[model samples]
Target chain A: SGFRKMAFPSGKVEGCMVQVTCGTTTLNGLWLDDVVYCPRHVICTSEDMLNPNYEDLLIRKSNHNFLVQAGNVQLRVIGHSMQNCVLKLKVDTANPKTPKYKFVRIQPGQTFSVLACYNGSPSGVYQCAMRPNFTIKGSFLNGSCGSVGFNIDYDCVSFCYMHHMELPTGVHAGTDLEGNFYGPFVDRQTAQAAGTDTTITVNVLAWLYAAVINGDRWFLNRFTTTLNDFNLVAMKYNYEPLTQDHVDILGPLSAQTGIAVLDMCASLKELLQNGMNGRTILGSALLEDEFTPFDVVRQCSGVTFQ
Target chain B: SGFRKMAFPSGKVEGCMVQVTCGTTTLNGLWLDDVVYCPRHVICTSEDMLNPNYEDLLIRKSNHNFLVQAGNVQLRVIGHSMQNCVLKLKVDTANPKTPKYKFVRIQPGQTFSVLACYNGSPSGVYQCAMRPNFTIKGSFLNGSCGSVGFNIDYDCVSFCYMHHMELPTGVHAGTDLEGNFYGPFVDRQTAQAAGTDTTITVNVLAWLYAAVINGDRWFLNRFTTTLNDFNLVAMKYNYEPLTQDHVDILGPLSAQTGIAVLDMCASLKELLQNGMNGRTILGSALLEDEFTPFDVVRQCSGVTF
Candidate 1:
């Protein structure tokens, strides 16, 4: 019979290491019958025969799980303790189309269970076989169990692979041509949120422009009143410098901001004394106010004083 | 001679290693004898044996430059070209009291030479020994040389050791109890040089106090002057509340300067709202002339209108 020869010893069978080779096929629902063993005393008794299968066992298959399929397989059991006993199962699928299977830690005296159901797409013809061997020594007082089983199935869905892509580049929106004048493009919403209208006063803008031109951070404070008043008056008069020439025409109004203008001139003189880089200050009040008197002193020294 | 007994046959010597052991006494002026082979080979002529004795040889005392009056020492040399050679030397002092020597290098077939102005020290002894069971071998082409030498000296001056022990703290000068009013310290030379009574202005003290109190950083501009003037006027005229007091004190001066003190106050208010740390403004007229009219208009927006 395909069941092969089964042994069911009743007397005290000594615990032993077990090895089994299940040849290239699905042995689903296969079973073994044999008497268990207690290797510690070597006494033959009915109580020592646990569950009949002393060395060989059965691992049944199910219809819901996906691993049961035809393949080359082996199982090995070693050690004497019921808890320490190990049953290892390894299967090699000869067909590249099949998924592999590996089973470990099938201890003795405990329920050895597995549920495998496969949708076999490829082939169905294969042979099935099982042989059990055992080792009993050390702390393990009882023998181990070994088993093998399988099923074949087919699958239809195509597997998908994923990869990452790079981002596209362009002139970021709201950025100016020179990337300096970040206004006009700044919609009313963000400008309102930033309190841009309130902060960018005519005097403040003048001070900021002077600071940038002279490389003087302190001009803002020295010409504080001029800066503040310039904003108020510019707002009241709806004043704006349209072109570089317009800035020249508004020069008189700039002088009205008091010593800040003069301080700016002094700061520019100092910058000139050092050397000129191409960074000329523009006439705009949309700049950030991250300057202090100390910065001006540090950058331009005495220019802030006068 | 003892050296003559040390000579060997003119074949290529093999399996040789030289070791020198330094003993307890001192010696001076040692030299090496020439090494020569046969005559037919142009490269193997006796001229190769005409090299100087003390030329390339080295001598190092075991205790470094520190003279060790007593100790055991060792030296080793290995080379491919060296063969059939005897090291010859003369101990200048038999009972050496003070010994001094210099290291020298030598090649094959070199003339050995030494000069001494006086006899060796009377309190020390000198001796020489060689390894009798050494030999050399292998290819003679593209050969090299390696050798070792040991030396001992006596009657050198003992050295004394010294080291630095003090560390500097910081600068200090005399001052009053408050640590505010400072310096009765006389600049006598400056006074003499100027030929006048030099009275130290309290501004020197103020500058010091400012450096100490403000952490050595501050700004000064017309606004600063206006602020100070405002405070002084408020103190004198008994102004109430002191809000925007610069307008009352420096209002006229600021107006003449083309910007009102009220404008400076407003600007300062804005700066304060924006969280300014500290700032100053200077009131020099030279600064006023270089200012473009538009520069002032932009700085004092309201004044321009």
Candidate 2:
């Protein structure tokens, strides 16, 4: 019987919903009859899952979405499938000597809210996908993955403008000031199927601290408002207000963007300070450029202040 | 005969004008000639003056206005003047290892508007006299200090709202949001003159970095805005914006503050991240206490991260 293994209607299994919506499977199943979150006993590739605990399981667009959250101390992984899947998640805050157990093994089905990393930025901020192996694939299960894309989670295609900020904490679709989907455009694999890998990467997760000092005016307003909204929801939690003024942001930005007055007789400090306007500055100016602290440092090539 | 030398009109030798108005000097006088600023060619006690070219000339309420303009570096002369005259001045910002020859001397009174220090607060903030000798006297003559106060220019009293931020630089009286005179209030000696050295320190210049990581939220916004206005002025006369945000400040202050997160189980990092609210967390909560970074550090005598 040379019958091909049926695709099983592809996508996610019946009971588990890996996304905001569930699988193509009939939802009103007995699994949901018990509880809302249908459990997934899905296991990863045998070598990384069963028998002995495999130290490293591959993580890629095929199965997981990744980002650096809580500065560097926490890494967020959004699982794509509850069906058979395995991922080795490694989060390095700053220190290099992170051990094997230190690297987390994200089981096939778990709402990875926040996994801890030992250290973090002195202040909370990090460039996504910028750190080496910081959040890369942990040695793909079969050595390589034919990705279906974990980017769908963050990909800003038609399903942009995901309402409610707090719910989708990290990667989710959103429209800019103008009503248009920005990118992480479908994933490289999917885009490869459709467009070119035309992989557009918006500097995801703009931190509040970075926005205040260095963000272009628009991003200043953007993050200002974002954090403000974050604050409003935070009221239920009893947090101090973070409502910001253009003036408030500009000042500390000026003070901290320290320059030793003159360098190369170029007045580098002057350049950093002068390009400001009364209207709010936003990181949006450079958003199209997609350059981040990572790019800036990369250009510097290992140059850092002592 | 041991004749008693009479105490004459001392303090600052006549200048062009720094006060709400100057002395009984005329506007069109020679002091107002070609030089927009008048040079009062007055002299100090001759002994302190021509020490064969005096190394440290005392600049008191008499001559120069102390406190650095760029926010951190300014001259501090340990004044030795009870009944004496003044000195004119010179200050340079472009050099570091300044020798005596380089330490700009304040002459008799050649419009010595401001002076220079050997160095300054590597961090660009100062708390009036909070630091040991940060804002001390501009050395006087007679080797006799009558009191301690370089706050002549920055007195947080009547002449409160001095316009043109860059020129006056630091420590002039400025009214608060409620129009009440906030301080660097009359410096120590003045407080001493009135109260029990009741040193009312406003805990001046608590930077953004410290506030976010540890300070009460209200002060967080307070310093945040103050620096923003400071940036507006920092824009002119060909200056660099001292622009800052949490990132810019965090690294430097971390290096300077030297307190790591979890260093003392003090998740200073968590504190900074936690208090952020959107209406905007300003540093208002401690308006009642007036405690500043200086106060924070003072409380942390070998106990901080």
Candidate 3:
């Protein structure tokens, strides 16, 4: 009858239809009529004549023009038959040599969708490909008909802000006032869910202190919010804990680059613990005195402070 | 040719010869005088009468018999053909339910020999069958024969008596004591060559010491000169070491058993070491020191001591 077009997350297509036409031949004293018919049946003889009788003989022909619509079939995948499907984003830094999109399967039935942020170009192209069972199926298609796209931004200001201070003499017998606390909180999921940006910053500070004190940089990196294009600059300078006065100055400068101070403290602690025998000496004075307020202030203020 | 009876391993046959016969069926005749005949153109006719001639015929006949001889006929074996194949010797013991002699494959290409030893009873008929891979074929005039017999004495004793002992200490220390060890070599070639009633004994004091020190009665059973017919008796008893004072008693007993006192000491030392470790220690010691000596002296004193 007619061809139609359909849209899918992968690609688009056109024309899908089937049609047929018939020719009539005249007999001794009878006239035959020629008409178009559906290609379902090619020959028409006594069968068609009995159904629709006319003054003359009319026969259905086999030849017809048929058009088929492309890309109209939609494959709806309900869910993976296997467990442990992973969805991941991939970026191809090398152009034609390497594929721009891929879907990787980490485990049985587990799939990860990879978004190629860099399509092997100086300014890489970001395209998504799904690797189901660790196999890349198709190329990226740009259209509204395909998969939905979302924007994810990394805020760096809320990440790298560090400060240190001296404990007030009579604050508490057990707890120190400037106890070199890096994170104000431990949980990241709950903090990030809070809509306000200020809440995100406060939660990140708390998370940084927790990550620093615990000597866990891996968790801190994933748990913290990204800065506005700050990763491009702050990645060069190292961050660490310092005295409260120094932190008050240096902390704000580092925070401008979206580098969390507590994150720096955590990194410094790990380096000192591993490179120096800090783990072996319990309650060593060097371990306690390593946190200097002047050094923190100098490093932090050097970033942006006049 | 004459017919003759032939004896074969499977059975005997008579009148097995054949002969050939020849004869002639022909006759000849001769005329005594010449006769004249008239010419046909002159129209003259002449006639003569003569008798038919016959000749005597003679015939010669010879016959030979085909007799089956044991040596003339050969039993061709098919599939895995070999001679002197080893077969498992299984006895029925006293069980009536089981067959007296059952053929068992000891190894690949091994089959029981017809000449196997049987000692149970006269009524006990030993039955043996061919192996799965072998088929027997007979040749009428081939050199083939089979033998059947029994070995009266056990081969285990011979196996135990042939091993030469080398003592690490005493006068015989680097030297191999020719008559101080025993063995029962049951390999077919060795046993067949040694034949029946071939007996030898060796003094195994050094071996006994090694066995006792190693706590191995099974080794002693395998390498000692004592006959396997003793069952487990030789294994059960301990040989005592002859102290200086007891050497006089050991000297004569050693001579009788073809063993030396030092060798006896080695055997005794081995026995003591291998004897019971805990509860039976005292009993084993008393038996080694007192009971064993009495048994040996009582049983062996008449031989040579």
DockQ of each model against the real complex?
Answer: 0.01, 0.01, 0.00
* lDDT tens digits by residue: candidate 3, A252-297: 4345445565454444434333533313111121222221222122
Judging by lDDT, tell me the better candidate of 1 and 3: 1
- Local distance difference test values of all predictions, in order: 0.21, 0.21, 0.19
Off by over 4 Å in 3: A1-306, B1-242, B274-287, B292-295, B301-305
TM-score of chain A of each: 0.17, 0.18, 0.15
Provide the lowest-lDDT 10-residue window in model 3 chain B. Answer: B4-13
lDDT of 1 by residue, B1-305 (tens): 00000001100011111112223212221112111111011122233323423223223222222111111222122211212222222222221222233333321111111111011111101111110111111001111111112221121211110000111110111111111111222211112111211211111112222222222222222443345544444344322223343244333334435444443433333333342232322211111111122222222221100
Residues B1-305, model 2: lDDT tens digits: 00000111111111211211122211111011111111121222334322322224333334233222222233322222211122223233232321111112211101111111111101000112222111221211111111111112211111111111111111122121112222333211122111112111122123333344432234222122244444343343222233243224234345655543223112222223353332222222111112233333322221111
Which DockQ value does candidate 1 get? 0.01
Arranged by TM-score with the best first, the candidates are 2, 1, 3
Estimate the lDDT of model 3. 0.19
